[PDB]
Design a protein around this ligand. Sequence first.
Ligand SMILES: CC(C)(COP(=O)(O)OP(=O)(O)OC[C@@H]1O[C@@H](n2cnc3c(N)ncnc32)[C@@H](O)[C@@H]1OP(=O)(O)O)[C@@H](O)C(=O)NCCC(=O)NCCS
Ligand SMILES: CC(C)(COP(=O)(O)OP(=O)(O)OC[C@@H]1O[C@@H](n2cnc3c(N)ncnc32)[C@@H](O)[C@@H]1OP(=O)(O)O)[C@@H](O)C(=O)NCCC(=O)NCCS
Ligand SMILES: CC(C)(COP(=O)(O)OP(=O)(O)OC[C@@H]1O[C@H](n2cnc3c(N)ncnc32)[C@@H](O)[C@H]1OP(=O)(O)O)[C@@H](O)C(=O)NCCC(=O)NCCS
Ligand SMILES: CC(C)(COP(=O)(O)OP(=O)(O)OC[C@@H]1O[C@H](n2cnc3c(N)ncnc32)[C@@H](O)[C@H]1OP(=O)(O)O)[C@@H](O)C(=O)NCCC(=O)NCCS
Ligand SMILES: CC(C)(COP(=O)(O)OP(=O)(O)OC[C@H]1O[C@@H](n2cnc3c(N)ncnc32)[C@@H](O)[C@@H]1OP(=O)(O)O)[C@@H](O)C(=O)NCCC(=O)NCCS
Ligand SMILES: CC(C)(COP(=O)(O)OP(=O)(O)OC[C@H]1O[C@@H](n2cnc3c(N)ncnc32)[C@@H](O)[C@@H]1OP(=O)(O)O)[C@@H](O)C(=O)NCCC(=O)NCCS
Lengths: 158, 157, 158, 159, 157, 159
Amino acid sequence: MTGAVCPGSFDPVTLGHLDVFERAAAQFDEVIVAVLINPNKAGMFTVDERIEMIRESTADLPNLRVESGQGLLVDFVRERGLNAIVKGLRTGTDFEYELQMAQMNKHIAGVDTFFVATAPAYSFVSSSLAKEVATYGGDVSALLPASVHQRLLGKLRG
Amino acid sequence: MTGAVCPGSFDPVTLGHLDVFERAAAQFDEVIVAVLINPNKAGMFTVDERIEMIRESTADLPNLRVESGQGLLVDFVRERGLNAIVKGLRTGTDFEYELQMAQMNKHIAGVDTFFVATAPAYSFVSSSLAKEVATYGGDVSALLPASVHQRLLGKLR
Amino acid sequence: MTGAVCPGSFDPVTLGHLDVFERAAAQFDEVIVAVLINPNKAGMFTVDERIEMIRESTADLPNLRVESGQGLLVDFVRERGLNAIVKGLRTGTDFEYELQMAQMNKHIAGVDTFFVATAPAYSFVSSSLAKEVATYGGDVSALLPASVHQRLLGKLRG
Amino acid sequence: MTGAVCPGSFDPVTLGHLDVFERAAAQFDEVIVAVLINPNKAGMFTVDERIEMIRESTADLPNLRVESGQGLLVDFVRERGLNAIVKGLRTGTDFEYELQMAQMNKHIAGVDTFFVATAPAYSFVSSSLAKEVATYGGDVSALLPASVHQRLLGKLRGQ
Amino acid sequence: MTGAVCPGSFDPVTLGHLDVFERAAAQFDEVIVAVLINPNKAGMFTVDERIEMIRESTADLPNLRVESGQGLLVDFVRERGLNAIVKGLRTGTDFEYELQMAQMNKHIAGVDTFFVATAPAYSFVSSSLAKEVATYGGDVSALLPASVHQRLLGKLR
Amino acid sequence: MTGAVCPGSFDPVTLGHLDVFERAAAQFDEVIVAVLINPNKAGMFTVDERIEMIRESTADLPNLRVESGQGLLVDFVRERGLNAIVKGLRTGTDFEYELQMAQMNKHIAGVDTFFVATAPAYSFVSSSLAKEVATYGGDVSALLPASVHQRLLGKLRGQ
Ligand SMILES: CC(C)(COP(=O)(O)OP(=O)(O)OC[C@@H]1O[C@@H](n2cnc3c(N)ncnc32)[C@@H](O)[C@@H]1OP(=O)(O)O)[C@@H](O)C(=O)NCCC(=O)NCCS
Ligand SMILES: CC(C)(COP(=O)(O)OP(=O)(O)OC[C@@H]1O[C@@H](n2cnc3c(N)ncnc32)[C@@H](O)[C@@H]1OP(=O)(O)O)[C@@H](O)C(=O)NCCC(=O)NCCS
Ligand SMILES: CC(C)(COP(=O)(O)OP(=O)(O)OC[C@@H]1O[C@H](n2cnc3c(N)ncnc32)[C@@H](O)[C@H]1OP(=O)(O)O)[C@@H](O)C(=O)NCCC(=O)NCCS
Ligand SMILES: CC(C)(COP(=O)(O)OP(=O)(O)OC[C@@H]1O[C@H](n2cnc3c(N)ncnc32)[C@@H](O)[C@H]1OP(=O)(O)O)[C@@H](O)C(=O)NCCC(=O)NCCS
Ligand SMILES: CC(C)(COP(=O)(O)OP(=O)(O)OC[C@H]1O[C@@H](n2cnc3c(N)ncnc32)[C@@H](O)[C@@H]1OP(=O)(O)O)[C@@H](O)C(=O)NCCC(=O)NCCS
Ligand SMILES: CC(C)(COP(=O)(O)OP(=O)(O)OC[C@H]1O[C@@H](n2cnc3c(N)ncnc32)[C@@H](O)[C@@H]1OP(=O)(O)O)[C@@H](O)C(=O)NCCC(=O)NCCS
């Protein structure tokens, strides 16, 4: 009956993210991807756009589901009967802040955080950098799920 | 007679800050906590409210006083006859930026900076993260002085 | 049927280690502590001494067992039908090397590594520093399992 | 035919930047300082002011030129027939972000990035921190080229 | 005419090293790989064997040559009319120590050091870890040049 | 009655160390340089040589004294009625290890550790790297006090 939550803003989800999802799904009975949107800064995609892109990318993971959340991440995790978070590490990760959030989350609700390093091929993509490169005409297609890539072109052509 | 300045925005003061204050007060004859506002941010608490919360938290430290400041930190320090800064290190501290400021402050005014690591129990609280957790209904009472936590719930309600 | 391996030299096991064991045991169905002794540098305790100290400390973890290993860690993990490693992070951890080993281990055998930050109270103990402090007469009793503490005094009084 | 681009916003150029420019100019046949502009963000100095400050402080480097641009850095580099970037490292550099950008730039365009440590004397100045200290009256004259310092004081005193 | 030295013990050369060599050879007119032995370690391969493995791996790089050296690195560099070093960065690199050596080398001889990040695929191999994995029967063939991997299995058998 | 201990093996003392000694002496009433010896590891200089090199280079600091010791650092500190350590930070410092030691020393004896960044000019010298460069004939004269340099050359030329 094990389980973990993979949280993030996922604007959009990248192959770095998907790699983390897959490993979480391989090692825990149940995985929930929590789409948690920053309230002070709306992004490129709407919440249900973000959710759809993740669902499309994770169709081959039977024990994974995708839900949006508001408020504390630890409440999202516990309200679903779990108490484990899985986060990815990549080139550019602010690991010090990850550690700060991990300790805070453990303190306030007893939720553990597990970190896993993303695959080297996907270690340098992030949502913001992929969007920036794409805005300026660069090819980030090898770093994003195919479904995301087309939607991203749409949002930019607009 | 020795002395140091403990600068920050303290919005609000945390037990991590208080740990640093106590260590500075134990090792220097005089400590001045300098409450310095970022001119384009305002924050949650007013300067007066911040000073009041620090004073209540440092009531047992007779050689420490609290004062607002504006302008260059090193001017604040030197104008009070001192030339040392004491800064805390916690989980999430941008240490590279602390080092850059320390080198800059030494270069422009000859002021030294001493860093001290906060206690493990208080190493993951920061003003911003405490406010964010509190905003969403999380309990950060063990990470803040008693006076702060009450005032915090007040600004949120 | 989930499971993870917690590897190390554990010379001796500390409360930092025990914290990691407990979280692994809370989040995976099955946990194995692998005692892997460096072949070029014997330590303070023998392998079976190290094992005994861990077993004594982990008696309240039903789904945890302790075994010694030789050769590749990834072979230890896979020969037991698992493919997940759990490692602790503390103050002083060479995280860059942990990342290097994690990527290598994933490359050569498809084994994932999950990192978890130890509790603040136990974040500054390590085997080597605890031994050094103890050698010079300092009190590290709050940082080690009670069983370990007495054995450590014995090895030093010798 | 070797060459490298030294990119940045240079608002304003510092002695840390100049140190890096000089290393690059000593080790590559040609160097181009790329003053990259976000057309949406103004900054303190106009693109012409930024270029003039750099040119005045690099006059003794005959193989270095200064050009502005926008959009992708790797496009600026490749359209000049080059595929190397030289970036400086200082105290306060977000090196993890530099690594991410270097890996991304290599991936999308085959462009290499070489990092060099700025000299100790110039290792704690940045454009933003110099601007901040000067705003509050601190003396940053030893950290900026002469082409910059009084121009900076002029911008600040003009509110 | 420009040039750089790529120094190391290369015991053995890895594809991470080779990636760095290729980038240096693409950007400088002349590259010299300097094989420098730690005088109290000997290692797995002799200096001659190390040079041979590098030469086989860099056969397509006509402006790169391989040479053993001893003594101060900056002397090796300056004696060959150059004053640049190129070093690779990988996962596990002690970057703080690289920076210290780079500053020292610039101070004592005016020699510059340029760092370049190795490709992601080759970012987690190192000479020591490859040998350790290979010793215990693990397959590191994708992380080493072909010539190296064969010679490696040989020294182990 | 304020005071701090500046500990280390100082084999030999560097200008980086001296910079830290000077900061400590300016900010605490008394400073003790603790030359800590492992009785099993010899090092290059004897304890008397290490102390003499430090004393010759600190003669202008009237509130600083030099004493050797072994065993726990916190015992050395507390037996002098103090409970502060001052440590320098330089390029190449293992800061994570410094933090671990600082937390351990606080835990076992209530002793505080204050870190200070060494001046840029002296930020890349360490005892071991200076010894290594000098061994191979490099010029480290600008990174060591005069009390050290020729003594170092003497040790090396004596094989
Ligand atoms: C949702 C939450 C976890 C997001 O935090 P986060 O882990 O730092 O991740 P974010 O969504 O902000 O985004 C950072 C990401 O890094 C990248 N990233 C994250 N995971 C990645 C991965 N596996 N691979 C590649 N890149 C990744 C980016 O994609 C993205 O950054 P970018 O915008 O620069 O591209 C956090 O804000 C949260 O918990 N919110 C709920 C409120 C709360 O509980 N607050 C108290 C916290 S203690
Ligand atoms: C067994 C092995 C994982 C040990 O590596 P390691 O994770 O770095 O851990 P180690 O046992 O060497 O010891 C480091 C530890 O850090 C500390 N430590 C480790 N985990 C800790 C924790 N959870 N809490 C507190 N401290 C901890 C120490 O206790 C100890 O160091 P110390 O001796 O300085 O006290 C590794 O060497 C290995 O895999 N060996 C098998 C051979 C192999 O597969 N090699 C190829 C690897 S890719
Ligand atoms: C222009 C570019 C090279 C950035 O240059 P940079 O030197 O790395 O950083 P910049 O020059 O833009 O920014 C200013 C620097 O950061 C500083 N800074 C100040 N506040 C900062 C903050 N909150 N965050 C980050 N940097 C800050 C400045 O002080 C300055 O430091 P410096 O004086 O030493 O140079 C990079 O943004 C780029 O390539 N843009 C083109 C678009 C592109 O190609 N994107 C894809 C990248 S993979
Ligand atoms: C003595 C003590 C303070 C260490 O001092 P330190 O300045 O932090 O480091 P040391 O002086 O011993 O060691 C030499 C330094 O590391 C260097 N060094 C060289 N090779 C090194 C290596 N392989 N690893 C680590 N350091 C190395 C030296 O160059 C030197 O740097 P520096 O010149 O800038 O000072 C610490 O070991 C101690 O407190 N010992 C007493 C016993 C004790 O209390 N133990 C409990 C500690 S919690
Ligand atoms: C006041 C001053 C010392 C900054 O203080 P600081 O402690 O280093 O930084 P702050 O006071 O803002 O504190 C950091 C805090 O900001 C908040 N914060 C949130 N997000 C942040 C972010 N992205 N960046 C910075 N701070 C952030 C708090 O979380 C946080 O930590 P803390 O609560 O544990 O202290 C500095 O700005 C200063 O000297 N100002 C005077 C002007 C001057 O002299 N400038 C020249 C300096 S060389
Ligand atoms: C030759 C020299 C450049 C060192 O090279 P380096 O690449 O920085 O370090 P090495 O060549 O040993 O390479 C590091 C390698 O050591 C091995 N290694 C294993 N454990 C190690 C450890 N704890 N520390 C260092 N290296 C280790 C390899 O794993 C490893 O990485 P790599 O295979 O990816 O390159 C340097 O020692 C030198 O300049 N020597 C000449 C003398 C001199 O001039 N000294 C003054 C320098 S300022």
